[PDB]
Amino acid sequence: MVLYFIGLGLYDERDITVKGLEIAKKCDYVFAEFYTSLMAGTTLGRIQKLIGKEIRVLSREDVELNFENIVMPLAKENDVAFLTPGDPLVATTHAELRIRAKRAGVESYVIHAPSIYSAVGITGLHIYKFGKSATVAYPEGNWFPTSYYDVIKENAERGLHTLLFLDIKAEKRMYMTANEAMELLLKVEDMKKGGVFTDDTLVVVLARAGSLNPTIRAGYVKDLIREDFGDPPHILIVPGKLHIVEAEYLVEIAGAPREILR
Amino acid sequence: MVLYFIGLGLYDERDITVKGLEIAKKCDYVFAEFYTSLMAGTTLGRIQKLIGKEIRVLSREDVELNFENIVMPLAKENDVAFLTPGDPLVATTHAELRIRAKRAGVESYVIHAPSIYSAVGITGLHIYKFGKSATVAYPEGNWFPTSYYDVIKENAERGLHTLLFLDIKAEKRMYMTANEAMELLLKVEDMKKGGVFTDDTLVVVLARAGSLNPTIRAGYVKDLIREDFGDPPHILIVPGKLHIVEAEYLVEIAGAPREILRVNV
Ligand SMILES: Nc1ncnc2c1ncn2[C@@H]1O[C@H](CSCC[C@H](N)C(=O)O)[C@@H](O)[C@H]1O
């Protein structure tokens, strides 16, 4: 009579923690969602094979509207697991489901997994220097989101790095690329004109973190806005004031222009 | 010809990823450091038994001064694993080692694992609202550092949450408690008097993140400063104005006073 929120990690089925695996292997029913992020290095089958359980994949509507109709009932009589990409409570509204579980008399436990939020440490930027985070959202119809722009502004002023989660439309197999994010930013720039994001702004791109060879690139928007960073998912970062060791790593590992060394 | 940066996880020997465990098992040499942090929910022996290989422990001096002598050599002609708590490279300094590797013609790869940086999401606080992070350090001798205080002020001023790492003597295995951290911040409030941390400030304590039964508590400093949060490690969080969804979670899951639903939203 327990509900487990278990993370699957960054890239493939092996990014799950051993704790999460051994617990998933012994659950009676296993649910999961694959709309909050993209695990580009695996498939349901490989996940199922590793866990030895048939997994019922839920949609965003299933979760946000009928979680307590689809999952909780079984959770009151069995040991249920809910799987998600990366870490279940990072950049999702899943924490709310724990409130739903409690109100339903069901106990919930959380098993963490590698998250993009801390994986960005592989870019060499100091994790403690990241300020507020934001999401670059696809424009829909006449609605054109722009708040992420101000977030970068506020952080840069304080000399802090800005982490930008990129949009996703899982039902349409759409995963926003770093390129699309920059394009959208340049457009917000020409509208608000704040000297926040331009052709000369330094950005860091991290693609498919969790794989053995992720794409880690650093340079000026003018040089990267057209570069191919590989298949999604992608994460875009607008660094603030760089420490020497940070820029060095960016040069040695992310192939950044040495003109940032001064 | 390869060097593996493998993260060990949050608490115990099972917090490493399947990927990290299988790769470590296939490595010829396995190293480990426990001076950036410890793994309070387990032991070197338990980690060794799970990996099935001997683990040679490296000290700060071993790594920061002789990594090129002790590890890199073996990596040039073998598959070598370097194990560390949390997520590799989250610790400010380790990234530098990936540079040494490249120059020594040695491939290096990073195998990720959970970090408290993302694990704090279990507190119900939106990860995007976290601002600059800081470490609360013990005053010693004539030195009395107060920069973390300033970090809280700047983040809270912008409605952002502040993640505070608590001081740790890994070598001596000594943990600063959340209780002590609260006492220190109160003294800094007395010196700074900026109205950043007082008996009325709402804080969140997260202890033993990673274990199945962590301690998550939310409350006002006046009511938690003498509460027993259990065994270390302790992480202290000073949140900014709460989203109602956050306040609801802190009340229903972290036993926070209903009062936050109106006072801190
Ligand atoms: N492995 C990865 N590599 C690069 N970016 C990733 C990634 N995983 C997630 N992202 C970024 O994060 C966005 C989804 S938000 C969900 C993040 C997930 N809960 C976690 O903890 O990691 C993706 O659209 C992308 O912008």
Q: Is the peptide bond before B85 cis (omega within 30 degrees of 0)?
A: no
Residues B110 and B136 both lie in one domain: no
Same domain, A107 and A21: yes
Run of H or E residues at A188? helix A178-192
Q: What span, in angstroms and rounded, lies between the C-alpha atoms of A165 and A91? A: 8
Domain ends where: B97, B114, B131? B114
Beta bridge partners of B57: B32
Long-range contacts made by residues A255-260, C-beta under 8 angstroms, separation at least 24?
A255/A217, A255/A218, A255/A219, A256/A202, A256/A217, A256/A218, A256/A219, A257/A219, A257/A220, A257/A223, A260/A202, A260/A218
- The CATH number assigned to the domain holding B151 equals 3.30.950.10
CA distances from A100 to A31, A121, B125, B214, B246 (A): 16, 33, 16, 19, 14
Structure-token pair, residue A124: 């060499």
d(CA A84, CA A95): 12
Count of A-B CB contacts under 8 Å? 177
Q: Are residues B96 and B139 in the same domain?
A: no
DSSP letter string over B147-196?
A: HHHHHHHHHHHTT-BEEEEEPEETTTTEE--HHHHHHHHHHHHHHH-SSS
> Is the same domain home to A138 and A255?
yes
Binding residues of B for S-adenosyl-L-methionine: 10, 87, 90, 115-116, 166, 209, 234
Alpha-carbon distances of B185 from A255, B17, B135, rounded to whole Å: 42, 36, 12
> How close A88 gets to chain B, by Cα (Å)?
9
- Check residue A167 and report its DSSP letter: P
> How many Å apart are CA B85 and CA A230, to the nearest integer?
30
How many alpha carbons lie under 13 Å from residue A69 in its C-beta half-sphere? 6
Specify the residue for token string 């999460």. Answer: A20
Rounded CA-CA distance B86/A114 in Å is: 9
Q: Which residues of A touch B89 (CB under 8 A)?
A: 121-122, 124
- State which residues form the domain around B27: 1-114
B144, B264: one domain: yes
C-alpha distances out from residue A241 to A238, B47, B170, Å: 10, 39, 30
DSSP-assigned states of every residue in A198-249: -TT-EEEEEESBTBSS-EEEEEEHHHHTT----SSPEEEEE--S--HHHHHH
A38 CA distance to ligand 1 middle (Å): 7
Q: Which of A93, A133, A235, A236 to mutate to test the pocket of ligand 1 (most atoms within 8 A of CB)?
A: A235
What's chain A's length in residues?
A: 262
Could you count the other beta carbons within 10 Å of the beta carbon of residue B180? 17
Omega cis (within 30) before A233: yes
The pairing of strands A234-238 and A162-166 is antiparallel
Q: Are residues B74 and B155 in the same domain?
A: no
CATH number, domain containing residue A35: 3.40.1010.10
Distance CA A165, CA B242 (A): 21
Same domain, B107 and B129: no
Q: Based on the domain organization, do A80 and A163 belong to the same domain?
A: no
One-letter amino acid at A255 equals G
List of residues 6+ apart from B231 with CB closer than 8 A: B40, B207, B208
The domain boundary residue, chosen from A114, A139, A159: A114
Where does a domain end: A114, A132, A160?
A114
Resolution value, angstrom units: 2.4
The Cα–Cα gap between B81 and B91 comes to: 17
Number of domains in chain A: 2
Contacts of A145 (CB under 8 A, 6+ apart): A136, A137, A139
The region, left, alpha or beta by phi > 0 then psi within -120 to 50, assigned to residue A173 is left
Nearest C-alpha to atom 18 of ligand 1 is from which residue? Answer: A86
Distance CA B145, CA B187 (A): 11
Nearest residue to A218 (alpha-carbon basis) of A189, A245, A249:
A249
- The rounded distance, in Å, linking the Cα atoms of A193 and A109 is 46
**Shared-domain flag, residues B27 and B61:** yes
Nearest residue to B250 (alpha-carbon basis) of B210, B206, B197, B199: B206
Q: Are residues A88 and A157 in the same domain?
A: no
Q: Are residues B82 and B185 in the same domain?
A: no
Quote the CA–CA distance of A146 and A148 in Å, as a whole number. Answer: 6
- Say which residue the tokens 């999604």 belong to: A232
> For A3-23, b where at least 16 C-beta lie within 10 A, e where not — what string?
bbbbbbbbbbbbbbbbbbbeb
- SS3 of A50, please? helix
Q: Is there a single domain that holds both residue B32 and residue B45?
A: yes
- List of residues 6+ apart from B105 with CB closer than 8 A: B76
Return the structure tokens found at A135: 């999401």
